[PDB]
Write an enzyme that holds these catalytic residues in place. Structure first.
Site, PDB file in Angstrom:
ATOM      1  N   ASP A 157       2.071 -17.312  -4.520  1.00 45.29           N
ATOM      2  CA  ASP A 157       2.536 -16.185  -5.318  1.00 45.29           C
ATOM      3  C   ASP A 157       1.384 -15.579  -6.127  1.00 45.29           C
ATOM      4  OD1 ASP A 157       3.881 -14.231  -6.727  1.00 45.29           O
ATOM      5  OD2 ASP A 157       5.180 -15.638  -7.835  1.00 45.29           O
TER       6      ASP A 157
ATOM      7  N   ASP B 188       0.843  -1.181   0.000  1.00 43.67           N
ATOM      8  CA  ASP B 188       0.000   0.000   0.000  1.00 43.67           C
ATOM      9  C   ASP B 188       0.881   1.234   0.000  1.00 43.67           C
ATOM     10  OD1 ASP B 188       0.908  -0.601   2.615  1.00 43.67           O
ATOM     11  OD2 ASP B 188      -0.512   0.850   3.447  1.00 43.67           O
TER      12      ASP B 188
ATOM     13  N   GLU C 211       3.087 -10.084   0.354  1.00 46.75           N
ATOM     14  CA  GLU C 211       3.261  -8.638   0.377  1.00 46.75           C
ATOM     15  C   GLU C 211       4.617  -8.285   1.017  1.00 46.75           C
ATOM     16  OE1 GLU C 211       0.736  -6.269   2.946  1.00 46.75           O
ATOM     17  OE2 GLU C 211       0.949  -4.486   1.669  1.00 46.75           O
TER      18      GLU C 211
ATOM     19  N   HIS D 286       1.766  -8.743  -3.765  1.00 44.39           N
ATOM     20  CA  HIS D 286       0.745  -7.794  -3.351  1.00 44.39           C
ATOM     21  C   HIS D 286       1.379  -6.408  -3.277  1.00 44.39           C
ATOM     22  CE1 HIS D 286      -2.304  -5.721  -0.898  1.00 44.39           C
ATOM     23  NE2 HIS D 286      -3.123  -6.548  -1.522  1.00 44.39           N
TER      24      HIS D 286
END
Ligand SMILES: [Ca+2]
Ligand SMILES: [Ca+2]
Ligand SMILES: [Zn+2]
Length: 548
Positions: free
Chosen positions: A520, A168, A529, A481
């Site tokens: 994965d 993020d 992530e 991610h």
């Protein structure tokens, strides 16, 4: 008989001076029918010719009963020290991917360290080495979420910069501070692995080791997260999780969440470390880091625990809800004591020593206090000799428990089945770090081997034959991610993914698979992530083996 077994090697390779493992793992549905006395033969073979350069009978079988469940055989081709490119080949059996013998941890260190540059927030990137590019992002960071003595809710703070935390784009003081501390310690212990210009940065060639320029990026963001009374805001993020889009498309308003005493103390500790470490390079930045740390401690000495994490503050970012600040205050006290020499800081330490020192544990965003243990012992002048002796004993005991787990573990990873959590890779490497701390007090080759084994493990010595670092080895994470990677279709290299996790949150892995609990795929944020605090002990352990 050797179908479909696998031979596992470090997919980047091995330094000439080090032990060199290869692990033959049998099919889960297999022996069973191990013919008693059967012995696999391994060759190492030049990549170019197929010329055998090493041949050896493998020891085993061993059943990795406490972790993977696998049947393993193993070789140690340490003897092979000729630089080049190779393959491991079991006679009548599987072949490994290609790997190098050479100074391989220089390139690993590079990728892992430079990945921070590629995570920077608030600045355009168009990187030719990597292809990674995005325009200016999150230039509006950010607006104060709740009223406090200085600012009403809705006030604009200039809190631009810092690192995107993970996959993020949130920026979080709790990981940023421990991450910066750990890069600093890597540099402090292994300065010869780190040069000016090393990392091909905007700051390359300013006369300061690039790893310190990177650290300074993170720490300068911490300054902007500090309130004039010395308290430090917890994190900065949108109300909503962005989709899989570029950071410049993430145009939602971003908010500066409320202060926390753990964050205040973590930032104090990291800043006081930087004050010590940056002193020969940038004396003005050194002072400033020291002033900030001192003001933060003034806040802490006047304040009880402030550790509120309202559930609604998590609507677009993770909590990092570290619910005890004593281990963080200890660490801040040590680092401030170390650079200033002042009684006020050692008093806090001695007071704590009377009622109970923080638990000794691998460095994490919950408990960073091992850095305090180590820095007190190795860097503290004119300390209390009874405290110092307690700190030393805990350091050696910590490595000892780590080493015992490592010995219970066929693949090297010091983590037993049932205990694989989110960030297990980071935990492995952080335990590698405790082995190296003990090694540093009391040299001990098995500890250094056990630490190396954590690099081997994240780089392909594991039952999935997976490299958990993007852009490294032959089977890295292709679908991390990671919003920028996913949106851009351009890999960001050098990022360590969390790895195997017994306790799933998403669809694509089931529970209690231990070292096999990983997928994965883009959606698996609990397994696949990357995060800044994962890379920190990676850069540490890699730097140990890049320098000798
Ligand atoms: Ca530089
Ligand atoms: Ca804590
Ligand atoms: Zn950003």
């Amino acid at each position: 008989l050797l179908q479909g077994a696998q031979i596992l090697v470090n997919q980047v390779g091995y330094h000439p001076a080090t032990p060199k493992q290869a692990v033959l793992a049998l099919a889960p549905g297999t022996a069973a029918g191990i013919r008693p006395g059967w012995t696999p033969t391994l060759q190492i073979v030049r990549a170019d010719d197929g010329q055998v350069v090493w041949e050896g009978t493998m020891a085993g079988p061993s059943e990795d009963r406490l972790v993977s469940g696998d049947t393993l055989y193993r070789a140690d081709f340490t003897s092979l020290t000729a630089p080049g490119r190779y393959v491991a080949q079991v006679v009548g059996g599987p072949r490994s991917p290609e790997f190098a013998i050479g100074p391989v941890y220089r390139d690993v260190l590079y990728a892992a360290a430079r990945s921070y540059y590629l995570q920077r927030c608030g600045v355009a990137i168009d990187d030719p080495i990597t292809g990674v590019s995005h325009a200016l992002d999150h230039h509006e960071d950010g607006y104060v979420l709740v009223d406090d003595p200085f600012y009403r809710a809705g006030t604009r703070l200039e809190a631009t910069g810092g690192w995107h935390d993970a996959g993020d784009y949130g920026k979080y003081v709790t990981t940023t501070a421990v991450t910066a501390a750990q890069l600093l310690k890597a540099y402090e212990l292994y300065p010869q692995a780190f040069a000016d210009g090393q990392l091909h940065l905007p700051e390359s060639g300013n006369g300061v080791p690039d790893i310190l320029d990177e650290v300074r990026w993170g720490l300068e963001w911490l300054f902007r997260m500090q309130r004039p009374d010395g308290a430090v805001y917890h994190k900065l993020a949108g109300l909503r999780w962005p989709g899989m889009i570029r950071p410049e498309q993430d145009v939602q308003r971003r908010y500066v969440y409320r202060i926390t005493t753990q964050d205040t103390a973590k930032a104090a500790a990291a800043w006081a470390m930087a004050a010590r470490i940056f002193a020969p390079f940038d004396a003005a930045f050194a002072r400033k880091a020291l002033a900030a740390a001192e003001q933060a401690w003034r806040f802490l000495a006047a304040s009880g625990p402030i550790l509120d994490y309202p559930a609604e503050d998590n609507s677009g970012s993770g909590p990092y809800d570290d619910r005890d600040d004593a281990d963080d205050r200890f660490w801040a006290a040590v680092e401030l004591w170390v650079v200033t020499g002042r009684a006020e800081y050692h008093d806090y330490i001695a007071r704590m020593a009377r009622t109970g020192l923080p638990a000794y544990a691998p460095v994490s965003w919950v408990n960073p206090a091992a850095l305090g243990y180590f820095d007190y012992v190795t860097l503290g002048q004119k300390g209390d000799p009874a405290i110092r002796a307690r700190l030393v004993q805990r350091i050696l005991e910590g490595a000892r428990s780590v080493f015992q787990t490592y010995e219970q573990s066929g693949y090297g990873v010091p983590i037993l089945a049932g205990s694989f959590h989110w960030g297990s890779n980071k935990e492995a490497l952080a335990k590698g770090m405790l082995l190296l701390f003990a090694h540093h007090l009391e040299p001990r080759p098995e500890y250094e081997r056990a630490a190396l084994a954590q690099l081997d493990y994240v780089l392909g010595v594991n039952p999935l034959a997976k490299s958990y670092v993007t852009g490294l080895g032959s089977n890295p994470p292709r679908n991390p991610h990671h919003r920028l990677v996913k949106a851009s279709g351009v890999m960001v290299p050098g990022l360590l993914v969390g790895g195997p996790n017994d306790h799933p949150q998403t669809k694509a892995i089931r529970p209690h698979m231990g070292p096999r609990g990983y997928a994965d795929v883009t959606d698996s944020y609990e397994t696949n992530e990357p995060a800044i605090d994962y890379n920190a002990p990676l850069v540490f352990v890699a730097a140990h083996f890049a320098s000798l």
